């Protein structure tokens, strides 16, 4: 019920943009924005990566904001897979994406347009992917992709609910991706190109972010841990997968793992974002979920239209 007035402020902000009262800038190569409406688990990350993969015959650069990083200012995190900074400096997300996408460039920058210019100067990418870019209207995108999970529809605005913008804002989108289909499937019809996203369990990632068979977990029990607070969602996934934990450690959300002291011979499971902090530790893994999108080729055709 402060959500009523938050709605009024956001609306105003959107009207300023609609009526040309707030400046909008444009990069000289196509921009694809991936975003959502809600705070909380989104699949944005999974989908940004999937989308980068689809562009495998294009020089791709991801524009990410970083969130909490040990540095300040526009920063090239990775040059087509060549990592230039540590995860501390990069921020968890952009680093994780740099690690998993060896063909792609990643830039961390609060000033997104500026990040874009720096990339062009130094990397000459053919396409930008604007990570979490739906509300960032000051940067023009040629393809505005909006992610929606079933929960979003039954949700409210902040501070009551998790919505950053009202549901009506869905109409700004060029295309919709309906997430978490594997667990909470739903349909949605707007006339907009619309795609169903599934995530399914492939295998493990070792600390080198190479793929390792889920098989090694058999008749083994693991020690599981994580930080960034998200400490039962993980427990939930592990349970659903029939994975036998034998203790669950929960570290503070900043935890840098410098004094992490493993038990010899024991198998550890943690999250992809914790794992980036434990490069080199063997017998430490994260779960690897792949994205399958329905009508991938349609999606591909839609994306490739930005190149004309």
3-state secondary structure of 85: coil
3-state secondary structure of 202: strand
Segment holding 248, helix H or strand E: strand 245-250
- The reply, when asked if residue 242 is annotated as ligand binding, is no
- The reply, when asked if residue 39 is annotated as ligand binding, is yes
3-state secondary structure of 34: strand
User: Computed over its alpha carbons, how large is the radius of gyration of the chain?
Assistant: 20
Rounded distance between C-alpha atoms, residue 62 and residue 97, angstroms: 9
- The reply, when asked if residue 42 is annotated as ligand binding, is yes
- The reply, when asked if residue 232 is annotated as ligand binding, is no
Alpha-helical (H) ranges within 107-163 are 112-123, 150-153
Question: Beta strands 222-226 and 127-130: pairing type?
Answer: unpaired
Rounded distance between C-alpha atoms, residue 162 and residue 240, angstroms: 25
* Residue 224 vs residues 132, 217, 237: alpha-carbon distances, Å: 29, 13, 12
- The reply, when asked if residue 41 is annotated as ligand binding, is yes
- The reply, when asked if residue 222 is annotated as ligand binding, is no
Which DSSP symbol is given to 40? S
- The reply, when asked if residue 78 is annotated as ligand binding, is no
3-state secondary structure of 107: strand
- The reply, when asked if residue 114 is annotated as ligand binding, is no
List, as residue ranges, the binding site for ATP: 38-45
């Amino acid at each position: 019920p402060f959500s009523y007035l938050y709605e009024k402020i956001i609306n105003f902000r959107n009207t300023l943009y609609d009526k040309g009262f707030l400046k909008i800038k444009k990069l000289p190569v196509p921009v694809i924005s991936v975003g959502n409406l809600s705070v909380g688990g989104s699949g944005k990350t999974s989908f940004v990566m999937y989308l980068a993969d689809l562009l495998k015959d294009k020089r791709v650069c991801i524009l990410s904001r970083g969130y909490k990083r040990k540095s300040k200012g526009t920063l090239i995190v990775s040059e087509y897979g060549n990592l230039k900074v540590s995860w501390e400096e990069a921020g968890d997300e952009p680093y994780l994406m740099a690690k998993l996408l060896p063909h792609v460039s990643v830039v961390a920058s609060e000033d997104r347009y500026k990040g874009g210019l720096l990339a062009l100067e130094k990397l000459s990418p053919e396409v930008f992917i604007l990570d979490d870019g739906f509300q960032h209207r000051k940067l023009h995108r040629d393809l505005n992709i909006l992610l929606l999970k079933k929960k979003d529809l039954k949700d409210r605005l902040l501070p009551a609910g998790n919505l950053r913008e009202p549901l009506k804002e869905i109409r700004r989108a060029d295309a919709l991706v309906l997430t978490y289909q594997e667990v909470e499937p739903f349909e949605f019809f707007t006339g907009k190109p619309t795609f169903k996203m599934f995530r399914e369990f492939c295998c493990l990632l070792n600390s080198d972010f190479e793929e390792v068979p889920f098989d090694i977990l058999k008749e083994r029990e693991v020690i599981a841990f994580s930080g960034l607070g998200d400490n039962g969602q993980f427990r939930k996934v592990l349970k659903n997968l029939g994975i036998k934990v034998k203790e669950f450690m929960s570290f503070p959300d900043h935890y840098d793992y410098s004094d992490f002291t493993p038990e010899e011979g024991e198998i550890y499971l943690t999250t992809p974002k914790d794992l980036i902090k434990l490069q080199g530790y063997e017998n430490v893994f994260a779960l690897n979920f792949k994205v399958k999108l329905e009508r991938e080729e349609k999606l591909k055709k839609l994306i490739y239209r930005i190149f004309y």
